[PDB]
Amino acid sequence: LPVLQKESVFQSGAHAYRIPALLYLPGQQSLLAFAEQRELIVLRRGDYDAPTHQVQWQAQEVVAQARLDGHRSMNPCPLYDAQTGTLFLFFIAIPGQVTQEQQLQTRANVTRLCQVTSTDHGRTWSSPRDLTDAAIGPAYREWSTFAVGPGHCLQLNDRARSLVVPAYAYRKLHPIQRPIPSAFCFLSHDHGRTWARGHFVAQDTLECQVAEVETGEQRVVTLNARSHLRARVQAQSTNDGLDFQESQLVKKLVEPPPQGCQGSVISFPSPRSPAQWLLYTHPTHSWQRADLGAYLNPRPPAPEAWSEPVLLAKGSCAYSDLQSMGTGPDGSPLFGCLYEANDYEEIVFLMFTLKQAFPAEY
Ligand SMILES: [Cl-]
């Protein structure tokens, strides 16, 4: 398909950069591209230059605040709070080396849920805040580890403008069997002051992302997760992510077994009747992490409504993250996509419009 921009934003022959996260700032009309650097989190800011309809990426910088002493930082999970304008960067912190506790108990949970916030459009960040105890509580010792995202988080359009952070945890349900992962959501109605841990979806679900859409008559949260099956796993919640209805397989969205691959999903105003449509990116190969494709769902989150994918990039492609960026030069919705490519040797930024990706719609 034709695109507005394709630029490698992170590069490393040593596969130093992985796990992309993208965040669009609507007022500034800029993007924040995060990635893990093999471990800390790095960032590149880029302003959408209207006159040239290109994002001008600035110099890479380390998010020095997004780290705990003696820990490795991973899984950048950003969010823009529309009510306050504050930016949240959730992330995971794990000890850099085996701890004394782990020496005695191999599966002891030593993973930390953290966050740093910014009130100046991501130019500077607050000291890190460990949210582990407040968000997970007593369930903490029941897991071997867990993670959030990777990729952008969600803010609902409810009265409270609730924050929903997608996540997954490896549950130590059997002392002999290896811990099995299950996706879920963290939910806050007060801009991160308090957190609730939602119930798990089906077992063996891993990196997931959530979006909010209108279906039937009200708004629901759709969770789209990586699986070890041949198709993606999806589930919807009518209570902001605290409880999900029965998980379902989305056969139209392929997953390459046995490992599967992380994928991204976002909602955006319908170009036309449903209020929102969904856009999702993930490799399209039946058993390899290759050929990144963009898929559209005009009647979300109905599994049967997903479109055939449009090829965004041929060849090796892995994790990705999407962000809507307002209206494009051609008048249709503008999108930004950050994805791993070329055997993890780089992270590429792609910017395109709905008209470019899905011509038939126009
Ligand atoms: Cl902004």
Distance (Å) from CA 119 to ligand 1 centroid: 10
The count of other CB atoms within 10 Å of the CB of residue 36 is 24
Q: Count of domains in the chain?
A: 1
- The per-residue b/e assignment along 178-205, b for 16 or more CB within 10 angstroms, e otherwise, is ebbbbbbbbbbbebbeebebbebbbebb
φ/ψ of residue 51, rounded to 5: -50, -30
3-state secondary structure of 134: helix
Distance (Å) from CA 307 to ligand 1 centroid: 32
Positive or negative, the CA dihedral 317, 181, 277, 164 is negative
Q: Is 124 exposed, middle or buried (0-12, 13-18, 19+ CB in 10 A)?
A: exposed
3-state secondary structure of 104: helix
State yes or no: 18 annotated in a binding site: yes
Distance (Å) from CA 202 to ligand 1 centroid: 36
| 22/152 Cα distance (integer angstroms) | 6
Residue 135: in which H helix or E strand, if any? helix 132-136
State yes or no: 168 annotated in a binding site: yes
Distance (Å) from CA 333 to ligand 1 centroid: 18
**77 has which bridge partners?**
90
Residue 136: in which H helix or E strand, if any? helix 132-136
The count of other CB atoms within 10 Å of the CB of residue 172 is 18
Domain assignment of residue 281, given as a range: 1-362
Q: How far apart are the first and last CA of the chain?
A: 14
Catalytic position from the list 36, 212, 255, 340: 340
Amino acid identity, position 15 = H
Amino acid identity, position 181 = P
CATH number reported for the structural domain that contains residue 154 in this entry: 2.120.10.10
Q: Is 319 a catalytic residue?
A: yes
Two tokens at 74? Answer: 């991973």
Count of positions (residues) in the chain: 362
| 7/41 Cα distance (integer angstroms) | 20
The count of other CB atoms within 10 Å of the CB of residue 227 is 25
Two tokens at 300? Answer: 């979300």
State yes or no: 193 annotated in a binding site: no
**What letter would DSSP give residue 162?**
-
Contact 166, 208 (CB under 8 A): yes
Amino acid identity, position 103 = Q
Catalytic position from the list 255, 319, 339, 346: 319
39-46 long-range Cβ contacts below 8 angstroms, 24+ apart: 39/72, 39/73, 39/74, 40/64, 40/66, 40/67, 40/72, 40/73, 41/66, 41/67, 41/73, 41/74, 41/76, 41/89, 41/91, 42/10, 42/17, 43/122, 44/9, 44/10, 45/122, 46/349
Amino acid identity, position 230 = R
Contact 99, 78 (CB under 8 A): no
Q: Which of 48, 59, 80 is nearest to 353 (CA)?
A: 48
